[PDB]
Amino acid sequence: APQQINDIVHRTITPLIEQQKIPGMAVAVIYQGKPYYFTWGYADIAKKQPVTQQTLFELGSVSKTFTGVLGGDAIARGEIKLSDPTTKYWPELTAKQWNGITLLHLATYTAGGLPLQVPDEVKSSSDLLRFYQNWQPAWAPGTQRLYANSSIGLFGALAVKPSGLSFEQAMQTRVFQPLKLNHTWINVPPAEEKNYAWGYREGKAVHVSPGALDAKAYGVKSTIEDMARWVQSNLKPLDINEKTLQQGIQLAQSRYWQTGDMYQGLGWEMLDWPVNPDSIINGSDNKIALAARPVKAITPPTPAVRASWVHKTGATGGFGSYVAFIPEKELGIVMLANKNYPNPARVDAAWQILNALQ
Amino acid sequence: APQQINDIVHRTITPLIEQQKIPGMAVAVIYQGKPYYFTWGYADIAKKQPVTQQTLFELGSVSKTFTGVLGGDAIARGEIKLSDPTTKYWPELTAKQWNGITLLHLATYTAGGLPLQVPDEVKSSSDLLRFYQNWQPAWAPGTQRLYANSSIGLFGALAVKPSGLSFEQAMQTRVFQPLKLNHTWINVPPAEEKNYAWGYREGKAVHVSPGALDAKAYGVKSTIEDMARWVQSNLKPLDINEKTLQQGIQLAQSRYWQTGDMYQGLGWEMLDWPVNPDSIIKIALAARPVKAITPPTPAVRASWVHKTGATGGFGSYVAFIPEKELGIVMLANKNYPNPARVDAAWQILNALQ
């Protein structure tokens, strides 16, 4: 890599790893639209397996960006509309509190306080229907943003219903394959198991536990190379050949709601560039990022703004991930670690690097 | 033309011209992405000049499609947002009724009953400010649609303000030029006058009169060839190289409001295809309640996308179906009834679909 990139990355991520006791880390920096790769430590400590360009990490909530784009793609295909009632695509969801809750609300966490997690006890298809049928909103639809796996999770599940594909097949054939993300998986196949990093929590090797809607909200695993390609694709959608996927990526960066200085896209969250770093760093703290916030509708949504900081934090029990990019500058970063460490540390490190190269 | 195209066109247009006493007409059919041209009669009866594929016709309200796309292009450039208050681009507009009226409202005739025409008295920029300042809405913004030149016209004027360009220079540089519409004019140059058809109203030769906002709402003139290119660009926006223009076209065909079976875009109006011909087939003022499409539906390829247009002496129509790669332009120098245009267009496109 050019010396300026090596310099800032080494000065920033290397000490971060030391400070946070991260066993293994892969970083990609996209600079002038080209990817550069950096690796530290071990994917599996016991086996002394190094992190490589082939190592799969749990993306955790970064998976919501895939779900948003896939939803975007279904919109572009004319299969769904964000303006449609949730019930249009789940006619079994008949309970009265669902009147007026649309796919937009589900996708953008604005349905009225759907919970952060689907409860652990919810397993089966029947458990899930029961859960949503009994759920009572804290607020009217389209008034408050409460970040929620149960919200975007349901969006993903419903977005694929008209296609008649499973969520996994739709994701693979409409998003992963066209973008040649060949080592990106919702379900890691046996052939990839040797490349699947262990996460570490309290010193113990762990993988994400299965859960209802996992695939839609937090279940994707990917390598630093595929994630760099994911950044390139989101940086430059209009270079994608599949017309609906091109549009889908664009739609996921539309600004639907504003709270403070942030705007909610589909999976992606965005701020105007230049940003105040303290705003994204402080705002990434879960005490803020997971709290209810009043939203103002953007009526109608603002199309993808090139001069934006576009980003998403992701974690599982044993992993912490971050993706940030600025379309105007052709500049991006991906940070994948097999320890879950605090969000502001990730955002601060990413800011230092991108601000240095911008 | 392939005989089948030749045959539906001739069998439909011949009786139309006969029944409506149209002096001159040009039609283009876009069929699987290739244009086919037909011409009949006189551009100028007195001078016995025929309609040709180079004849300029007044598009009338079809001009709003250009304005809608140019707006869309300005949104894509991040110069404007449809959610912006009108006063963001015209701070001089201080009267209180303008609170809550956005560029979306102006673009989609939902501002609360702006009038169909700007009064003839209104000419200067100070006249225009006074007009909009004095205007009293009958309705709250975003509740009813009333088709209005004063609404989309102002939208057009404001949308180009951040660019620094005049409306005409923005239209030329950002829409006409990139799409190779090289015989499409807001102001017909003297060199091109030999091609400019006369319109006919009660048998008298007429051209459209100057008015405030004419350029934005009804003032474009074009050839059947340029209009076929316009249709092709709108049939296939993601084929256009200039990214903001492609986006702008796409945004102009988004569905913002619903009234009955019709959806309002920016300039363009759309119905779901297959469309009941009766749901498409004059009334001086038609106020209708609108349902917001929240958030707007991106351009649906399975649509009948259309716009009628009239001046005192001209009647135009454009309709296309993106999913079928099919379209039609009908340009005539008589303002004849809208339902006759739509029927003819539907007969032709249904036969080819």
- DSSP codes of every residue in B122-191: --SHHHHHHHHHH---SS-TTSEE---HHHHHHHHHHHTGGG-S-HHHHHIIIIITTTT-TT-BSS--GG
- Out of A83, A250, A300, the one facing B83 most closely (by C-beta) is A300
- Per the annotation, does B147 bind a ligand? yes
How far apart are the C-alpha atoms of B267 and B252, rounded to whole Å? 7
B117 is in an annotated binding site: yes
* Cβ contacts of B298 on chain A, cutoff 8 Å: 75-76, 247, 251
In chain A, the residue whose alpha carbon lies closest to the alpha carbon of B298 is A76
How many alpha carbons fall within 13 Å on the CB side of residue B202?
Answer: 0
H or E element at residue B261 = none
Cβ-based neighbour number of residue A230 at 10 Å: 27
Residue A114 amino acid letter: L
Chain A residues inside the 8 Å CB shell of B82: 300
Angle at B335 between CA B329 and CA B341, to 5 degrees: 40
CB-nearest to B298 from A247, A256, A297 is: A247
* Other C-beta atoms lying within 10 Å of the C-beta of residue A210: 9
CA angle B44, B47, B48 (to 5 degrees): 70
Q: Rounded CA gap, A184 and A192, in Å?
A: 10
* Sequence positions preceding breaks in chain B, C–N over 2.5 Å: 281
Contacts of B83 in chain A (CB under 8 A): 298-300, 302
Marked catalytic residue, from A61, A150, A254, A321: A61
Neighbours of A134 (CB within 10 A): 9
b/e for B290-311, b at 16 or more Cβ within 10 A?
bebbbbbbbbbbebbbbbbbbb
Residue A159 carries which side chain, given as an amino acid letter? A
Residue B236 structure tokens: 């296939």
| Residues of chain B found within 8 Å of residue A79, distances taken between Cβ atoms | none
- Which of A81, A155, A244, A264 is most worth mutating to test chain B (most B CB atoms within 10 A of its CB)? A81
Instruction: Indicate the pairing of strand A269-272 with strand A320-326.
Output: unpaired
Q: Tokens 């076209």 label which residue?
A: B249
**B201 vs B199: CA distance, rounded Å:** 7
A303–B251 CB contact, under 8 Å: yes
Q: Which helix (H) or strand (E) holds A223?
A: none
What distance in Å separates the CA atoms of residue A59 and residue A319, rounded to the nearest whole number?
7
To test the contact with chain B by mutation, choose from A110, A255, A299 the residue with the greatest count of B C-beta atoms within 10 A, namely A299
The closest of A211, A84, A61, A71 to A148, measured between CA atoms, is: A61
Q: Is the preceding omega at residue A85 within 30 degrees of 0, hence cis?
A: no
CA–CA dist B286, B341 (Å, integer) = 19
Angstrom distance (rounded) from CA B314 to CA B318: 14
Question: By C-alpha distance, which of B221, B174, B217 is closest to B195?
Answer: B221
- Domain ranges across chain A: 1-358
Q: Which residue spans within chain B are E strands per DSSP?
A: 24-31, 34-44, 49-50, 57-58, 144-145, 199-201, 204-206, 221-222, 255-259, 262-264, 269-272, 288-289, 291-297, 303-310, 315-321, 326-332
Give the residue numbers in B contacting A (CB under 8 Å), as ranges. Answer: 75-76, 78, 81-83, 102, 104, 238, 243, 246-247, 250-251, 254, 256, 293-298, 300-302
Q: Select from B182, B183, B178, B175 the least CA-distant residue to B216.
A: B175
Query: Which of B78, B256, B300 lies at the smallest CB-CB distance from A78?
Result: B300
| Cβ contact A247–B82 (<8 Å) | no
Residue pair B331/B316 in contact by the 8 Å Cβ criterion: yes
How far is Cα A122 from Cα B171, in angstroms, rounded to an integer? Answer: 57
Kindly indicate whether the domain formed by B1-353 is annotated with CATH number 3.40.710.10. yes
Q: Phi/psi zone of residue B60: left (φ > 0), alpha (ψ -120 to 50 degrees), beta?
A: left
For tokens 């703290």, the residue is A285
- Tokens representing residue A143 in the block: 């008034």
A100: left (phi over 0), alpha (psi -120 to 50) or beta: left
How far apart are alpha carbons A149 and A245 in whole angstroms? Answer: 23
Q: Name the burial class of residue A161, with classes exposed (0-12), middle (13-18) and buried (19+) by CB atoms within 10 angstroms of its CB.
A: middle
Torsion angles phi and psi, residue B113, rounded to 5: 100, 40
Structure letter (DSSP) for residue B30: E
* B158 CB-near residues (< 8 Å, 6+ apart): B80, B86, B89, B90, B103, B106
Residue B75 near residue B107 (C-beta atoms within 8 A): no
Q: Which two tokens stand for residue A170?
A: 């739709």
Cα distances from B128 to residues A140, A162, B90, B96, B266, in angstroms, run: 42, 50, 12, 17, 22
- DSSP letter for B194, please: G
Q: What three-state secondary structure class fits B272?
A: strand
Per-residue tokens: B66: 């250009």
Q: Which has the closest alpha carbon to B71: B93, B110, B114, B103?
A: B103
| Cβ contact B308:B278 at 8 Å | no
Place of tokens 């009669």: B41
| φ/ψ (deg, to 5) at B85 | -60, 145
Q: Measuring CA to CA, which residue among A351, A346, A348, A345 is closest to residue A335?
A: A346
B58, B199 Cβ separation under 8 angstroms: yes
Is the separation of the CB atoms in B243 and B293 below 8 Å? no
DSSP for B224-248 reads HHHHHHHHHHHH-GGG-SSHHHHHH
Cβ neighbours around B11 below 10 Å, total: 13
The three-state secondary structure class of B57 is strand
Q: Is B222 annotated as a binding residue?
A: no
Of B158, B188, B179, B199, the closest CA to residue B51 belongs to: B199
How far is residue B1 from each of residues B9, B10, B37, B38, B54, measured CA to CA in Å?
10, 11, 8, 9, 18
What is the torsion angle, in degrees rounded to the nearest 10, for the CA atoms of residue A87, residue A83, residue A115 and residue A251? Answer: 130
**CA B22 – CA A358 distance, rounded (Å):** 62
d(CA B155, CA B251): 15
Q: How many beta-carbon pairs under 8 angstroms link A with B?
A: 55
DSSP per residue, A288-347: HHTS-EE-EEEEEEEP--SSEEEEEEEE-SS-EEEEEEEGGGTEEEEEEESB---HHHHH
Contacts of A306 in chain B (CB under 8 A): 78
- Solved by what technique? X-ray
Report the Cα B251 to chain-centroid distance in Å.
15
Asked: is A1-358 a CATH 3.40.710.10 domain? The reply is yes
Contacts of A85 (CB under 8 A, 6+ apart): A98, A99, A100, A101, A102
Is A296:A259 a contact under the CB 8 Å cutoff?
A: yes
User: Who's near A315: CB < 8 A, 6+ residues apart?
Assistant: A60, A61, A321, A340, A343
Q: Of B303, B316, B229, B318, whose CA–CA distance to B35 is shortest?
A: B229
Considering only CB atoms, A104 lies closest to which of B102, B238, B295, namely B295
Of A76, A78, A302, the CB nearest to B81: A302
Going by C-beta distance under 8 Å and a sequence separation of 6 or more, which residues neighbour residue B235? Answer: B30, B33, B320, B322, B325, B326, B327
| Biggest alpha carbon–alpha carbon distance for chain B | 61
Task: Say whether A61 is catalytic.
Answer: yes
**How far lies B57's CA from each of A228, B36, B52, B201, B345, in Å?**
52, 18, 11, 14, 18
- The rounded distance, in Å, linking the Cα atoms of B351 and A144 is 51
- Angle CA B227–B231–B233, to nearest 5: 115
Say how many Å lie between the first and final Cα of chain A, rounded.
16
Q: Which residues pair with A36 in a beta bridge?
A: A29
Backbone conformation region of residue B107, classed left if phi is above 0, alpha if psi is from -120 to 50, else beta: alpha
Residue with the two structure tokens 């540390």: A345
C-alpha atoms less than 13 angstroms from C-alpha of A77 in its C-beta half-sphere: 17
Phi, psi dihedrals of residue B147, rounded to the nearest 5°:
-50, 125
Q: Are A155 and A122 in contact (CB under 8 A)?
A: no
Q: How far is CA A309 from CA A56, A266, A270, A329, B20, in A?
A: 26, 15, 6, 10, 58
If you search the block for the tokens 């300042």, which residue do you land on? B133
Which secondary structure element, helix H or strand E, spans residue A45, and what is its range? none
CA torsion A313→A314→A319→A325, rounded to 10°?
Answer: -50
CA distance B147 to B151: 8
Testing the interface with A: which of B75, B80, B81 to mutate, by most A Cβ within 10 A? B81
The reply to whether residue B295 touches residue A256, judged by beta carbons under 8 angstroms, is yes
Q: Which of A269, A267, A218 is nearest to A58 (CA)?
A: A218
Report chain A residues whose CB lies below 8 A from the CB of B296: 83, 300-301
Q: How far is CA B142 from CA A183, A352, A357, B1, in A?
A: 48, 45, 45, 46
Cα dist. B305→A83, A191, B69, B200 in Å? 20, 50, 14, 28
Cα–Cα distance, B342 to A266 (Å, whole number): 39
A83/B295 Cβ within 8 A: yes
- DSSP designation for B323: G
CB-based contacts of B192: which residues, under 8 Å, 6+ apart? Answer: B56, B183, B185
The per-residue b/e assignment along B259-289, b for 16 or more CB within 10 angstroms, e otherwise, is: beebbbbbbbbbbebebeeeebeeeeeeeee
* Calpha distance B190→A258 (Å, rounded): 51
